[PDB]
From a paper:
The bacterial enzyme inorganic pyrophosphatase may serve as an example for this approach, since it exists in a hexameric state that requires conformational flexibility for its essential role in converting inorganic pyrophosphate into phosphate. Moreover, whereas all bacterial inorganic pyrophosphatases function as a homohexamer, the eukaryotic cytosolic and mitochondrial inorganic pyrophosphatases function as homodimers. Hence eukaryotic inorganic pyrophosphatases have different oligomeric interfaces than those of bacterial enzymes. This suggests that it may be possible to inhibit the bacterial inorganic pyrophosphatase safely by targeting its oligomeric state rather than its highly conserved active site.
SSGCID has solved the high-resolution X-ray crystal structure of inorganic pyrophosphatase from the pathogenic bacterium Burkholderia pseudomallei, and a subsequent FOL screen of this target identified several fragments that specifically bind at multiple oligomerization pockets in a molecular interface between the two trimers of the homohexamer.
Author numbering:
A (entry chain A), B (entry chain A), C (entry chain A), D (entry chain A), E (entry chain A), F (entry chain A): 2 to 175
Amino acid sequence: SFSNVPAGKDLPQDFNVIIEIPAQSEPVKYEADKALGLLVVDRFIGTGMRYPVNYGFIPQTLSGDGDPVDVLVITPFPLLAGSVVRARALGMLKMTDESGVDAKLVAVPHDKVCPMTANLKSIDDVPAYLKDQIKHFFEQYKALEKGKWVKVEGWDGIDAAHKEITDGVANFKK
Amino acid sequence: SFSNVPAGKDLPQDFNVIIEIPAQSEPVKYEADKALGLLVVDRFIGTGMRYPVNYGFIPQTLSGDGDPVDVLVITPFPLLAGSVVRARALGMLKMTDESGVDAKLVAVPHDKVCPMTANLKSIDDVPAYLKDQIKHFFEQYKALEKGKWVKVEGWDGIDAAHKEITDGVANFKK
Amino acid sequence: SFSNVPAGKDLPQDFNVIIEIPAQSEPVKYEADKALGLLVVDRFIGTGMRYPVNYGFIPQTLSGDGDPVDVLVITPFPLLAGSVVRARALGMLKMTDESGVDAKLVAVPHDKVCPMTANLKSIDDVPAYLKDQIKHFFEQYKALEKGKWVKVEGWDGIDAAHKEITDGVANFKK
Amino acid sequence: SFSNVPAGKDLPQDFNVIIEIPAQSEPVKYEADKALGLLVVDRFIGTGMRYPVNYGFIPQTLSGDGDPVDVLVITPFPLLAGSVVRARALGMLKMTDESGVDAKLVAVPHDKVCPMTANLKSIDDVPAYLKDQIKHFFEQYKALEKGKWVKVEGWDGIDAAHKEITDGVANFKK
Amino acid sequence: SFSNVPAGKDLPQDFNVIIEIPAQSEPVKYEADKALGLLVVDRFIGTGMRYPVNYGFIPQTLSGDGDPVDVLVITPFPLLAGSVVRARALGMLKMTDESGVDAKLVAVPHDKVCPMTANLKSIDDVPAYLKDQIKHFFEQYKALEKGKWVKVEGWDGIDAAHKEITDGVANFKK
Amino acid sequence: SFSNVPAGKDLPQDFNVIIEIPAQSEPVKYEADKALGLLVVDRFIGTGMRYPVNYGFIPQTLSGDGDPVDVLVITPFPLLAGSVVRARALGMLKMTDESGVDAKLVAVPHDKVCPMTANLKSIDDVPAYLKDQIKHFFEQYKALEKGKWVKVEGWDGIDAAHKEITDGVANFKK
Ligand SMILES: [K+]
Ligand SMILES: [K+]
Ligand SMILES: [K+]
Ligand SMILES: [K+]
Ligand SMILES: [K+]
Ligand SMILES: [K+]
Ligand code: NA
Ligand code: NA
Ligand code: NA
Ligand code: NA
Ligand code: NA
Ligand code: NA
Ligand code: NA
Ligand code: NA
Ligand code: NA
Ligand code: NA
Ligand code: NA
Ligand code: NA
């Protein structure tokens, strides 16, 4: 299943995201097992906080931590966990957590998939209130797990997102 | 996954439907990718309109357009996207859209799966209000996508549904 | 999919459960098809009654009836149907139904997956009201299906749960 | 609020129902307080069972037990708790419980409010599966409360419903 | 209840809206009864179509048709039916229906109530896709009721909204 | 409506709570207007955080800030906004915010209303994970509103809750 989905139709700018956690879903952290082809319950989020936007990963990528490249996808209605969405990048949130460096991309679907998000061209177009909510979420969601923490370094734009994607694709192929 | 599900236990009258879109779900059009084994987001429906009944397809069939045979399944509670339901036919809605001829079957589950729908023997037993809603849905849901349109030709009964199924099974095997 | 998930990381006490029916979901009985890798609609529950806790099975086990070992998993929020949860046993409900002996385990997730349930050490820690609801559910949910019935024999503890799991693993390997 | 709503525009056949419990709502029994004008939590249902159809009462009536006349209203989507619906009668369920005789009417909205239910002319038109679910609900929902019980005597038709309504209106005026 | 809520703290620009229909709620048209103080079920929408944004009215106003001034309020999450929201105007949709002229205002909450909508200053700031959905909704939702119809004339801005509000307040006082 | 509900049947230990915000509801802060008898939208919570338990107030009380006494009510399913629940106290959370001292009670329903919570006798019986979530919620929910802040001082028990209630009742009567 998950293992055979292409990273994208035209990398890095035209990529695929497998959804693990729908926006506003009850506070349960699922992670795709690429060796089982199934979503696995990683943990019940200690704080009870919910992802403000959809969360998933790009298949066939391997990030700095040995996990696939992480992606937040903004949509007008939550997406189904375990579904695939063709997406494009807006930018990224840079952070470090208990396991070291942690960048997450911020994306929207392809314009023909989601006309509603077509006018979001870069991270600067995302409403400030949403940006602020995403940043608060990552700063606070691990507050009640011993040994876990997050510091947000800052936002970066589309070119940085594309580097992260090209690196991830390369690293995965070895 | 999807590719290996049989078209049915006793074709054409006793067939399987893989669900893509639960009745009344938020207005997001998923399509099964039979080569990925996963549901893929085709588009956010432009009008925000919702399927009035469950929508899916018969696996191992190939309709006139090169897609599997499409099915609307009526149930007392929505079905899970990506699940399989053993079904029987009531009839069909005949239409033409921007890509040519487009028939969709109307079905209910097998009587032992859904005793609640056992008294629906043919399309004529479906409440007129539901029939009318389904027809309005197909007439209007594509209203806000350029280049897309639908004209409803009319309803047909169980024998026409069975032909569509037998043709689809034959065509798929080449 | 389902067929390749291990029964557990350290049997019998540390096992995996694939979820078929989320706690409080609409009254539709799904069963995993291990040969299709998909959830299948077994039936619309005749009484309209809902599982009071999550329901699923241990993969790679084979119980007395030729089905995998059944498990009720208690969580603070319902789990996703078709997901996998690492679990530990609390005890079991002993019953006989129309097809003979029927034991179901009662479990919670691993403590690092669900800290919220860490203080449930055995079946005796489960609130009496929940115990009573589970027992009423099994006594009544089949009331409206001809030829189906259930008598509850009683509760048993962790050691009995572990026997059921070890037997199931052994039986599956032939 | 509740106290000033008329029992109906043309009694007994054209009456009003104030909704206390939406069909399929979580298992919490609300009762309108006509002296507070507010819904009050009577109890968490011990069995966790849910009303299969909407439940409420006719204002300005006084039944045999000193409570207003009780009504089950069938609709295609649940109604809002605390809302008012213009309705007509289909029949009634006769029962006795721990507090003596207990009849409940079965109704649908006025035809111009709910065209979808226009073809239900009497209790005999209600699907058998729904009838059976309603009867099971009342037989079982109090199973886990000490001192509470219900025996179902049987169904009766529109004329009996109308008597119950005329009596209730008369009794309320003293 | 409803009858005593002020039309606004500083008319016409700072006004109150009582919500009758939450955005995306199941397709049931409630109307506030100002003489009962309660929401009343007007009808089950024939097409099954849902309001794309919250819908309600300004209390203590009387529009051209003898009903209070109608308002669509855009929010990031649906509002509770029967609740009150302090709002400001963006513009209006002009229409005529079976009962003659029908203008509906488009509004957002006060900036301190909803910071998320602060950057919407006029109707021109509303995304085109949302504008298009609202217009499609009114063009189509009455399609299945005999004797009912709607033609959309066009959009107008904040000053026209304010006139409609001042007229409504004046007309209500006689 | 709200203004005429008694503070309780036997104060301070047997009191009434009017619910403003159901546990886990979308992140919108409603406040009862006792002069309108209606729920009013105070604000969209800036952080998007949700109340982990039901939130409301005791009618006919007047706390140190000039608002009624605030109460968190723990239940197995969320309660309806605007409903009334007979409750008993477990303890209280002591805090100071931007407007000075701020104590909130923690309660459960009367034992006959909610048998499921009967074994919670005091604040010390509440699971630590829930206690921790409630405290995190109040520490963080106002993070994104300028001029607003909260420091948690600590927990206190049933006797302190009862003082707060007796003071509130006295203060309200002048
Ligand atoms: K490229
Ligand atoms: K055949
Ligand atoms: K072991
Ligand atoms: K009459
Ligand atoms: K003014
Ligand atoms: K006392
Ligand atoms: Na990362
Ligand atoms: Na991380
Ligand atoms: Na087709
Ligand atoms: Na088509
Ligand atoms: Na079993
Ligand atoms: Na069984
Ligand atoms: Na009665
Ligand atoms: Na009764
Ligand atoms: Na109007
Ligand atoms: Na109109
Ligand atoms: Na306070
Ligand atoms: Na405060």
